[PDB]
Amino acid sequence: VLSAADKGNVKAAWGKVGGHAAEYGAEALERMFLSFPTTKTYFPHFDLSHGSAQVKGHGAKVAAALTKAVEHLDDLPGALSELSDLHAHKLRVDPVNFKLLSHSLLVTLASHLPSDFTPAVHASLDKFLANVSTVLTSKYR
Amino acid sequence: VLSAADKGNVKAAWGKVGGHAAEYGAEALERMFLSFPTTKTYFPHFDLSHGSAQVKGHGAKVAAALTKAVEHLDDLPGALSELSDLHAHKLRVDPVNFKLLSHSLLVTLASHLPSDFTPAVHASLDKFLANVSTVLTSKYR
Amino acid sequence: MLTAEEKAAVTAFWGKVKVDEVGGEALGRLLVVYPWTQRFFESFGDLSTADAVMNNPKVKAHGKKVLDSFSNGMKHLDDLKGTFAALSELHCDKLHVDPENFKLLGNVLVVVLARNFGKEFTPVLQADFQKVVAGVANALAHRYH
Amino acid sequence: MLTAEEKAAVTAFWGKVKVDEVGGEALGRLLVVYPWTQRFFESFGDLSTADAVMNNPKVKAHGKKVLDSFSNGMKHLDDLKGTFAALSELHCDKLHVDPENFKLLGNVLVVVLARNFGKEFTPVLQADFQKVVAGVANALAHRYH
Numbered sequence: 305v306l307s308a309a310d311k312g313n314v315k316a317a318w319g320k321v322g323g324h325a326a327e328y329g330a331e332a333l334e335r336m337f338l339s340f341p342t343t344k345t346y347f348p349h350f351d352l353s354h355g356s357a358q359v360k361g362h363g364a365k366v367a368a369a370l371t372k373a374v375e376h377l378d379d380l381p382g383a384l385s386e387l388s389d390l391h392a393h394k395l396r397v398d399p400v401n402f403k404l405l406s407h408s409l410l411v412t413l414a415s416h417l418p419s420d421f422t423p424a425v426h427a428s429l430d431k432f433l434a435n436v437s438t439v440l441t442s443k444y445r
Numbered sequence: 446v447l448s449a450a451d452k453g454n455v456k457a458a459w460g461k462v463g464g465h466a467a468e469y470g471a472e473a474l475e476r477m478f479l480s481f482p483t484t485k486t487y488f489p490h491f492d493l494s495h496g497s498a499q500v501k502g503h504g505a506k507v508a509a510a511l512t513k514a515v516e517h518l519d520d521l522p523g524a525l526s527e528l529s530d531l532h533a534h535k536l537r538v539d540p541v542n543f544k545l546l547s548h549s550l551l552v553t554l555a556s557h558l559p560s561d562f563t564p565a566v567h568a569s570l571d572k573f574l575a576n577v578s579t580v581l582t583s584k585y586r
Numbered sequence: 587m588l589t590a591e592e593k594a595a596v597t598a599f600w601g602k603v604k605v606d607e608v609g610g611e612a613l614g615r616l617l618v619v620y621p622w623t624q625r626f627f628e629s630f631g632d633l634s635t636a637d638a639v640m641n642n643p644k645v646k647a648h649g650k651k652v653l654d655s656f657s658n659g660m661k662h663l664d665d666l667k668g669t670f671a672a673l674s675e676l677h678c679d680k681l682h683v684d685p686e687n688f689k690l691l692g693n694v695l696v697v698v699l700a701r702n703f704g705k706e707f708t709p710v711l712q713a714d715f716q717k718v719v720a721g722v723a724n725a726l727a728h729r730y731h
Numbered sequence: 732m733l734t735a736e737e738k739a740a741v742t743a744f745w746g747k748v749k750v751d752e753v754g755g756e757a758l759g760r761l762l763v764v765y766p767w768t769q770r771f772f773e774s775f776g777d778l779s780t781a782d783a784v785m786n787n788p789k790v791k792a793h794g795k796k797v798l799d800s801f802s803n804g805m806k807h808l809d810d811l812k813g814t815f816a817a818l819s820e821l822h823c824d825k826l827h828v829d830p831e832n833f834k835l836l837g838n839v840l841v842v843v844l845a846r847n848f849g850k851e852f853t854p855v856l857q858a859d860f861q862k863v864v865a866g867v868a869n870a871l872a873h874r875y876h
């Protein structure tokens with residue numbers, strides 16, 4: 305579970321992301337797609353070229369979901385209810401892929417926030433993304 | 446995380462285990478040590494040979510913790526509080542090792558409860574052991 | 587892979603495995619226990635309930651192929667890599683199955699051997715089979731390396 | 732593994748960057764982010780807090796050696812297997828390190844490079860480094876197979 309200290313770290317880091325959330329979401333997707341080509345097969349309907357409108361639009365949605373999570377750190381399972389059903393039931397996303405996007409998000413945040421991305425903050429964000437990932441992979445039928 | 450159906454399956458299966466829990470925990474440890482010899486290194490001053498009283502004694506303790514967990518599915522974090530500090534903070538058990546013990550437990554249960562170990566029950570027990578493993582690994586911090 | 591004597595133990599035991607049932611049970615359990623794996627089998631018809639998965643003739647038929655593939659690897663334990671060649675390119679370069687799932691299916695097969703063979707499937711024997719399935723998983727994943 | 736283009740990119744980047752504190756940061760971050768990894772470093776002293784870990788002189792010194800090994804790897808990209816064969820047995824058979832951790836460290840290293848190196852560490856260049864660290868991790872895990 306996220307500690308109160310972890311929640312503090314997550315909220316402050318996301319505050320630092322500030323107006324760049326959608327931009328970082330898009331960059332994280334791009335880094336996922338280039339580093340881990342297997343993840344591309346989830347988006348056969350996308351133009352995945354650098355700067356594509358679909359990746360940009362999708363980066364913004366992923367970012368908005370992370371924003372929602374950050375505002376709801378005391379109850380992630382409730383906050384991400386619809387998204388969990390979608391990823392686990394409809395899209396059948398392999399749980400390994402959440403680790404790939406999470407790493408891609410940490411790389412992005414590290415790159416843009418190098419003074420804010422201390423080891424403690426890195427550890428809190430990693431737990432946050434893992435917990436989001438746990439929630440989004442927690443639901444079957 | 447366990448659904449109502451999962452909790453039902455886990456309680457029914459563990460009922461079938463009954464008074465054999467200690468025996469099955471000892472067998473599962475044995476299978477873990479033999480199949481995955483690096484797990485032995487967490488027990489440097491145990492004799493881990495077949496029939497060792499230390500393996501039998503420890504098997505009984507692991508099974509007791511599992512029985513406690515089956516009785517407290519709505520609150521695994523609280524029920525396994527002491528054990529999570531022991532494994533995650535004191536002993537610093539690598540999270541891989543819980544997957545190895547969980548598999549060994551599934552093997553042992555499948556062996557001894559073939560008529561009870563349906564695909565649905567296998568899936569429920571898998572989720573239970575993953576959730577026990579999550580709790581036991583939650584206090585590295 | 588295994589010692590000459592480990593090979594002998596595994597060979598003798600494998601003789602008893604029913605070439606049909608076990609594969610279908612393993613594949614069916616993979617799909618039930620790890621539902622994301624269903625993503626790879628969209629053409630197999632109804633996979634919506636555990637009963638549907640287990641009784642699906644396409645799952646049963648395909649399970650037989652995978653088990654026959656395992657049976658084939660059991661004959662080539664010192665050269666699993668070459669033996670799982672066309673399979674590694676299929677599973678990796680064409681299907682893009684994450685290799686973690688090769689480990690999971692290997693482990694399901696072991697659980698299935700346990701359920702079917704009970705006390706005969708001893709800790710030592712099972713340990714031998716763990717080496718085998720890890721060998722098969724590693725061979726299948728080679729096209730990613 | 733890498734195209735000639737990818738090898739040229741990785742090599743030019745590694746040539747220019749100032750990395751003498753990178754390895755210590757990467758090892759420090761591993762032990763902070765994944766604290767079970769501390770089990771392997773008891774002889775290093777105070778690892779009781781994030782700050783203690785990061786400023787531990789032993790962590791910093793070991794990390795530099797670890798990066799030195801990575802750089803050696805970078806100079807023999809055609810033979811990561813042979814290059815890490817000895818280190819593989821040390822880590823797997825003597826130190827009992829689960830091979831998943833080799834992947835975690837490679838990925839921490841990538842995060843560290845991104846933190847230290849700004850816009851030049853592009854998605855394309857980072858993906859090349861992912862190939863490198865995946866190669867190092869596979870080479871180190873080899874004595875598992």
Ligand code: HEM
Nearest residue numbers: 343346347362365366369370387391395397401402405436
């Ligand atoms: C941090 C973890 C993740 C978050 C917060 C997240 C969030 C989202 C959101 C907000 C949407 C739009 C849903 C809607 O229309 O209501 C979406 C869709 C989708 N996601 Fe994720 N996602 C995550 C992980 C992943 C991963 C790891 C993959 C696969 C590699 C994936 C694949 C997809 C796909 C294929 C869609 C449908 C996209 C489309 O057709 O436009 N997601 N996700």
Ligand code: HEM
Nearest residue numbers: 484487488506507510511528531532536538542543546577
């Ligand atoms: C299902 C998951 C597990 C359960 C329910 C469990 C349960 C237990 C219990 C009840 C104890 C005794 C606590 C005490 O002494 O007060 C214990 C101790 C211990 N456990 Fe676990 N455990 C699990 C997983 C693991 C794994 C995967 C490993 C390592 C591979 C491990 C290694 C140990 C060690 C080294 C001790 C101390 C033994 C000694 O030296 O006295 N545990 N565990």
Ligand code: HEM
Nearest residue numbers: 623626627651652655656681683687688691692722723726
């Ligand atoms: C780990 C051991 C595995 C073995 C020995 C194995 C074996 C096989 C074999 C023998 C075939 C038929 C290929 C041909 O005739 O050319 C096949 C096809 C296939 N396998 Fe596997 N497989 C393994 C793992 C997996 C896993 C883990 C998955 C999915 C999560 C998977 C998904 C598939 C799919 C989707 C096909 C094509 C089915 C179709 O549409 O016809 N395999 N496999």
Ligand code: HEM
Nearest residue numbers: 768771772774796797800801822826828832833836837867
């Ligand atoms: C990028 C992957 C890795 C590389 C290239 C690497 C390289 C090395 C090298 C070159 C040494 C010997 C350094 C010396 O001369 O003193 C070493 C030692 C060691 N490594 Fe690693 N290593 C890696 C990953 C890991 C991981 C993930 C762990 C554990 C979580 C680990 C645990 C150890 C330990 C315990 C030692 C001995 C330290 C001592 O002397 O007390 N290594 N490694």
